């Protein structure tokens, strides 16, 4: 059936250039119009413009004329979206959708998954993993909470686990902040039985790939 | 451009309830409105294409109405999978233009967070740093105030939130934040204290600790 597949996640200093990729499978490219929508994080969603293989015309929306192109490739059915200088504000989610032409009544009923563009000033940096360790300030009822600060890193994203996988039950791992450095950090908590504390280990495994930091920290009481 | 207003942003309801969103558009554009989903994480989905058309194989519980500048779509017995994000588009005119969005939220009963404080790691501290977290767990409503306080003085701008997405199994939020100091201011103060204020306590919350001790 119909898929459309986008090229991976991107990460930039501004200034640089970037052409990302949306390659259509299971139908006739050149009867269709691609469209590039913009997701900022946390925000809705932006249509940047649209094109026809077939006809080899493109349309953009006035706030994204001059700063981007689009194009495409009808030999592998590839549309495509550049820059020529990123700034830090195209840091966005990128999506392709399909629609038609001036007359089609069907607008964007297939999507890419979508391509993630970062663009900051940053270098790439592994992550420091502090313990959250479990004490009295941290004991509710007959419930302790523990957890691993993972501070510092650059970009996006890391990935905990407790004690291997093993641990999963009442494990919430926040969503990262963007600190003013920014350096990346989040937290990863769990809330165990105060009578646990004690006796069984705790272990948060942290990967983050892309400075191929991985740390496995025991938390231990006070 | 033609701009859509979509209201409410936000909306709590009931598995089984049934609700109605609007979206309303500075031009007339006749049948051109569309109506899509967003789960996190996910591209959208199309729910709804042009003159109210629902799209093969999306359940009948979608409807939507509305002709000229005004529209609505009305989600009958809620289900778990559509407590995410709605948008609407029109279709009309360049630029196409999105709604800002409406996010479905489970309603829960109330219930207060357990609330933790992490002093900084004595590992944390050699590197120059100091990094106090305070953990609130299990909470609903989403909204919660936290004030960091050192020796009694409020601190403002110094700390930095974050919330988890709404529990899949008791649909509870939880929030850390972290305040963030030198390990010279850090070292220069004796009490830290993290006050949370949420609807399910009667009064504030205080979690302290006296640094050394
Ligand atoms: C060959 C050039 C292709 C260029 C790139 C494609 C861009 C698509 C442009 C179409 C955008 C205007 C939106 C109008 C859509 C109408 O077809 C429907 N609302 C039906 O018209 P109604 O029944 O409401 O009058
Ligand atoms: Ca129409
Ligand atoms: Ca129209
Ligand atoms: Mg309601
Ligand atoms: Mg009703
Ligand atoms: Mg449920
Ligand atoms: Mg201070």
């Known amino acids: 059936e119909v898929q459309l597949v986008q090229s991976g996640a991107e990460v930039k200093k501004p200034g640089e250039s970037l052409k990302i990729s949306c390659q259509s499978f299971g139908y006739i490219f050149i009867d269709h119009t691609i469209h590039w929508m913009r997701q900022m994080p946390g925000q809705g969603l932006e249509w940047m413009g649209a094109?026809?293989?077939?006809?080899?015309?493109?349309k953009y929306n006035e706030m994204f004329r001059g700063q981007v192109t689009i194009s495409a490739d009808k030999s592998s059915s590839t549309a495509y979206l550049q820059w020529s200088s990123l700034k830090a504000s195209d840091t966005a989610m990128y999506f392709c959708?399909?629609?038609?032409?001036?007359?089609?009544?069907?607008?964007?009923?297939?999507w890419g998954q979508g391509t993630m563009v970062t663009v900051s000033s940053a270098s790439t940096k592994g992550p420091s993993v502090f313990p959250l360790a479990p004490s009295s300030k941290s004991t509710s009822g007959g419930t302790a909470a523990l957890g691993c600060l993972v501070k510092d890193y650059f970009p996006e994203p890391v990935t905990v686990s407790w004690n291997s996988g093993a641990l999963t039950s009442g494990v919430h791992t926040f969503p990262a902040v963007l600190q003013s450095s920014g350096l990346y950090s989040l937290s990863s908590v769990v809330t165990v039985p105060s009578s646990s504390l004690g006796t069984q280990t705790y272990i948060c495994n942290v990967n983050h790939k892309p400075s191929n930091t991985k740390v496995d920290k025991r938390v231990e009481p006070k | 451009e033609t701009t859509v207003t979509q209201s409410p942003s936000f909306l709590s309801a009931s598995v089984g309830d049934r609700v109605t969103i609007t979206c309303i558009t500075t031009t007339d554009i006749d049948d051109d409105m569309n109506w899509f989903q967003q789960e996190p994480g996910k591209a959208p989905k199309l729910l709804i294409s042009?003159?109210?058309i629902l799209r093969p194989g999306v359940p009948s519980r979608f409807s939507s109405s509305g002709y000229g500048t005004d529209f609505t779509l009305t989600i009958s017995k809620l289900q778990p999978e559509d407590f995410a994000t709605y948008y609407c588009?029109?279709?009309?005119?360049?630029?196409?233009?999105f709604g800002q969005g409406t996010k479905l939220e489970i309603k829960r009963t109330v219930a207060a967070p357990s609330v933790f404080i992490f002093p900084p790691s004595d590992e944390q501290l050699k590197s120059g740093t100091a990094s106090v977290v305070c953990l609130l767990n299990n909470f609903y409503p989403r909204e919660a105030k936290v004030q960091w306080k050192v020796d009694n003085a409020l601190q403002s701008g110094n700390s930095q939130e974050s919330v988890t997405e709404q529990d899949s199994k008791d649909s509870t939020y939880s929030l850390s934040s972290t305040l963030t100091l030198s390990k010279a201011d850090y070292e220069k103060h004796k009490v830290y204290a993290c006050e949370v204020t949420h609807q399910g306590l009667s009064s504030p919350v205080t979690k302290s600790f006296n640094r050394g001790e």
């Open positions: 042009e003159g109210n």
């Open positions: 094109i026809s293989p077939r006809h080899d015309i493109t």
């Open positions: 959708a399909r629609g038609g032409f001036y007359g089609s009544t069907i607008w964007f009923d297939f």
């Open positions: 588009l029109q279709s009309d005119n360049l630029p196409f233009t």
